[PDB]
Design a protein around this nucleic acid. Structure first.
Length: 57
DNA sequence: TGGAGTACAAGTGTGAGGAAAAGTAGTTGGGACGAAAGCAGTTGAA
């Protein structure tokens, strides 16, 4: 079940964590060059809830 | 100066033992990209 989280990114939880989305939690570490690869690890994301908003604040 | 009993061995049927590497007997491990807008016929009660 932990592999299913890491294979899809879908968060199945009977509680619901304190988080506001249920998907996209894991990405593919690409190796097309090293700059692509090292910058997956310095990358941070605001949340997928904010990708659907029309406000640019 | 003949017979009555008799242990030592030559000699004859019954089954019972011996073994192994093939198979099979019960437990445990393990298999399984969507929280969009002004708007309209029906439809709320006045």
């Amino acid at each position: 079940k932990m592999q299913y989280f890491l294979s899809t990114g879908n968060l199945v939880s009977q509680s619901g964590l304190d988080l506001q989305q249920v998907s996209g939690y894991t990405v593919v570490a690409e190796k097309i060059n090293f700059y692509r690869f090292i910058s997956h690890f310095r990358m941070v994301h605001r949340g997928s809830f904010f990708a659907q908003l029309k406000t640019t604040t």
